[PDB]
Design a protein around this ligand. Structure first.
Ligand SMILES: C[C@@H](OP(=O)(O)O)C(=O)O
Ligand SMILES: C[C@@H](OP(=O)(O)O)C(=O)O
Ligand SMILES: C[C@@H](OP(=O)(O)O)C(=O)O
Ligand SMILES: C[C@@H](OP(=O)(O)O)C(=O)O
Ligand SMILES: [Mn+2]
Ligand SMILES: [Mn+2]
Ligand SMILES: [Mn+2]
Ligand SMILES: [Mn+2]
Lengths: 333, 335, 333, 333
């Protein structure tokens, strides 16, 4: 039997501090999307959250770097609770929190909210993919940035969802490399929509959104990678032709690394060189990072991904130092 | 704004014994085609979108006569699409904006969609639609004999979840650039059990556990290039078999297979007819965008003329159906 | 499965005319409760509604008398949908509309609302006993006056309900004759309350009422009748002592007639004589009247009560003429 | 915004032990109602719960006596959360838990449920008056016996409620002494009913109850006390005439003590003498008892009532010893 959002909000109401951090980070990201600030948004952290203890530890380490590089980078943790699978498989902490096929969704929603509240309380803003239609009412108040995934960017129900979110949103190119669907999606999500959604009390209702003015695209590769200067330039052209923001984000992982976590640093190096040359159209980067590198089928090892493989903490330190130094030069130019 | 729950609509428009029987029977018949147990050709045919119930009922009456006439060769089911996925923005269909004026009277739209579907089934004409929205199906799905998941949503996990709990057979379209694998993947996904959030007949969110949908198949609807010919059908059947799913598929004559030109649908149908006459063992169905009047219009001025994708008119519809019936009659007679 | 009030409001929205009639009649009745007009409120009609056809016919006849006597009497029809039984039995049209133990409550609510909308549209305002806690959301917008019954006047949940109704409300003395519980009830219902109630969407909620300033008592007999001058005078004294309105209503039926419908006219005569001597504390009277007199266990005869016995239409004409003539004299003096 | 029962059941699910205690105690009480066991049910404790700490302390003391007298008495604590007032006033812990007019009903429901869970977990079954229509879904699973108050026994909505409760229920005579309304109420509540109620998910619904076969009357005084042998005998006769159980309960407080807490022991003495002569029609007694005697308008003193005045702990020990000794003799016959 499904508890409504108000039951979770009652137990875990947003704090003054978390509320402030969310508000501020959304504004800061909006400034990047619209070219008002030349800091680099960095969406970085696990492919998926499957353990809160490891997540909190990761966050504590990330926070020290968030502060250290705050003049160059705007660091925000990946806190992904919903995973789109190719066919079937574990869909994330919300859907199956005990990792055993019990689908204890009430527990999963409580735990997702609790983790997000602790993260924001310690000073670390959070990001997630918004995949499911009804779950956002449980946690979206704690989210500073949202993704719509490659598999759902062309979906009208996701563009509707995005049009009503209060955080900035990045739309990914399609899994085969189609960018136009993401440009289209900004067009769609920036407008007003009417559609059915569920209230905080757990009731279906008609909602009328105002449109989301803070949307941008994400280059995450296709049949070929799309992270280099030539692809970025092509994309900026099309963005301008559609009359939407020509500031974009580049995912170092997924199809840009060819699913090989060791190649994320390669992509980051290319981005660093672009930032040093010019890189005027880059407002952000995405990175799949955990305490420990690689991946595992069963959750045996602490801080090691059970979905896409990630770089470990050591490489994370290097990647962030690399991007901070490069962007410091861009910002000084 | 104040959304009525499905039970309010079910109270005013409860399913009849006859409509319930027609739906049950047609779903079974279509399942038999999906699994190669019958060699009749499923034909999903009708308007791109429903925007007028009067014209829809008139179209249905004409179609019914041909449904009966060709019932040994073709299993004809009307396109009764209430939900339209747009490229960017635009009219999303009768449910979202029934008065066609930007008033978004969704309660009226749901009532009217249900009423039309009940009348169609009561006159003997089964209905099909694209299932796009997550919450609307509880209002009408009991009256639907076949569902589409669109090219733009086939790769979407929430649509595969939805499909996994529907009681009707479901066709998954290849992606707008031509990717077939996402539709094969989608059958894999939708045929399994899922747990997810959905809304009850009382209008309350709830956890649902579906049993998986065993009646799913792919639809070839074109990409950067058309994919309707024998070479593409054969390639697709191979992949289907490699994934261990049904290698019987449907071919859309419209959208990217006609290159968005309604006058080319007949071309595609002719190619399918020739395939059915040579062999065509992997074809179980075809889709066609048809209305009383051909073409399209921005405003709903002309009666029975599409306000979304352009359609063939009634005359060409008669020819197209006769062409497919004759061709499939030969297939069904062949040893 | 229970439809929420919004489903019924969607099918049967209140009209401009019915809205106006309700608003006006509530104001008019308030004027009587607070001694600003000396017309006599007359709550008259069947013990219970069991047939809408007969109800509409009765209403059409009553309307003619409502117009005729409008300078002396303010006539409002008894349209009672909810009946409190001594032990068990038929609870009214809402609970069991088909009169067969099928309890088709959705149909009953729809039919109760439809009838009330037609009555108001033809110019006849309606009254009912408010017995059930959740049903009022379905029809209260069409009610000009409400009763809380003898069996429920001492009940805190009914006093809460009354405190939030937008129509004037009469509280009946207890079945053994206790008047204090009704005086207490005005005290209670005139104040603000917080309690649980159900919304128009069918969801439980906390409500905060403002108190009902239009409440008054009804004398309906006990072990003995309480309709005479001596009892009216005693009651007015106690009313003043409790600092509440000393204008009251007298029921000609139930324990004041000793459950004998032929004695209602006796009571009405006594009231008429009071109105002619003085009768300053009387603002209303209640009468159980139908097309045909008496009662019946099965609904075999048209327009004949299946609950308490009623006077027939001929005696109804006489009773109303008697009260109109008596009050015309009161008003002139 | 009102949380639904499932939110509270999620945080405070019933335990194996509490569930067992509730189940056993209901059965044991049923056996007393139907004359299958001659132990005396004793409903004893505060007029109202306003403090959980004091309530838990009281319960710990009462538990020791519950064990000590378990062969003679079946002791169950008064854990009343809902109070019917004469006009206006504090309605109990649920309605206004902070005792300040803030009406924090969500907090009140949570706290009521938490207290009941702790009481049952320590071995002490609980009783309450069921006054409100929607609150029972939050706690009734933890209640071993329920009262319908003197002010609501004649109310059809309370008789409906009772008909669907899973615990035995006592109906009180009316505030002026009318017993027939309580006999009528057993008749009503023992039958099946259809009516509107709210589900564990907080939605209104139609419910079909099976009737409550475990109902009985409670003599709690009227204009005069009704606790003596004469009154008990008169009541048993009427009970038998109505074909319902002629085993009844006697309230030592309220109108039987003439609202004087010191007189409760007097009433208990009379009952003891009855149990020693014969007393075959007595199955229970009710007593208003707290840690400290008397009452207070403000909650200044610990363990002292803020509603009706109670006897203190010392007199409680004497009263219970008196009833145990008397009933031990009855049981031995
Ligand atoms: C879901 C995946 O992103 P994408 O949509 O680019 O495949 C991820 O970030 O883990
Ligand atoms: C929505 C469209 O289908 P497709 O998903 O192939 O674009 C249609 O049937 O009008
Ligand atoms: C229920 C009855 O009134 P009372 O509450 O005085 O018995 C009636 O009006 O039919
Ligand atoms: C409410 C009161 O009992 P009664 O209903 O007899 O007044 C009590 O037990 O506190
Ligand atoms: Mn990933
Ligand atoms: Mn189309
Ligand atoms: Mn009556
Ligand atoms: Mn008390």
């Amino acid at each position: 039997e499904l508890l409504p959002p108000i039951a979770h909000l009652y137990e875990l109401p947003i704090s003054k501090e978390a509320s402030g951090l969310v508000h501020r980070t959304r504004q800061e990201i909006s400034d990047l999307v619209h070219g008002r600030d030349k800091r680099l948004l960095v969406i970085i952290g696990p492919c998926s959250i499957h353990d809160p203890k490891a997540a909190l530890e990761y966050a504590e380490r990330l926070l020290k770097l968030r502060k250290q590089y705050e003049n160059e980078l705007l660091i925000v943790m990946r806190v992904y609770f919903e995973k789109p699978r190719t066919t079937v498989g574990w869909k994330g902490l919300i859907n199956d929190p005990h990792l055993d096929g019990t689908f204890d969704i009430n527990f999963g929603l409580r735990q997702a909210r609790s983790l997000l509240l602790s993260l924001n309380n310690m000073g670390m803003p959070a990001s997630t993919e918004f995949l499911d239609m009804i779950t956002p009412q449980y946690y979206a108040d704690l989210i500073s940035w949202g993704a719509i995934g490659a598999r759902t960017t062309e979906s009208q129900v996701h563009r509707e969802l995005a049009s009503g979110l209060s955080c900035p949103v990045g739309f990914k190119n399609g899994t085969d490399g189609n960018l136009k669907i993401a440009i289209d999606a900004i067009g769609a999500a920036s407008h007003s929509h009417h559609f059915l959604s569920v209230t905080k009390a757990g009731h279906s209702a008609i909602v009328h959104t105002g449109g989301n003015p803070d949307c941008h695209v994400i280059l995450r590769g296709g049949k070929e990678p799309n992270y280099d200067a030539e692809h970025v330039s092509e994309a900026a052209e099309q963005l301008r032709a559609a009359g939407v923001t020509d500031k974009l984000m580049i995912d170092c992982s997924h199809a840009n690394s060819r699913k090989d976590y060791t190649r994320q640093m390669e992509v980051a190096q290319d981005i660093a060189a672009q930032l040093e040359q010019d890189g005027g159209n880059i407002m952000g980067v995405m990175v799949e990072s955990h305490l420990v590198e690689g991946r595992q089928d069963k959750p045996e090892v602490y801080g090691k991904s059970i979905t896409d493989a990630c770089i470990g903490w050591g490489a994370t330190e290097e990647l962030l130092a690399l991007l901070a130094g490069a962007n410091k030069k861009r910002m000084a130019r």
